[PDB]
Design a protein around this ligand. Structure first.
Ligand SMILES: [Ca+2]
Ligand SMILES: [Ca+2]
Length: 72
């Protein structure tokens, strides 16, 4: 938070699971598998709608930077 694009770049690394460069809804499920939660596909897709400008069902590094640039 605090209007920082660099923080968004670091957080994107936390979201991708295969080191493939794109966050897919299934890579996002692995983050919930780490918490031990079962996720429905819409929960992951609604999270993408907040910041994914394309609404493509996957967050690119650039789409991820768009999600929380400001948070202030
Ligand atoms: Ca990925
Ligand atoms: Ca996307």
């Amino acid at each position: 938070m605090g209007k920082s694009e660099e923080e968004l770049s670091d957080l994107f690394r936390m979201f991708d699971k295969n080191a493939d460069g794109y966050i897919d809804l299934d890579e996002l499920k692995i983050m919930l598998q780490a918490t031990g939660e079962t996720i429905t596909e819409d929960d992951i897709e609604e999270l993408m709608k907040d910041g994914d400008k394309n609404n493509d069902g996957r967050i690119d590094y650039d789409e991820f930077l768009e999600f929380m640039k400001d948070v202030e």
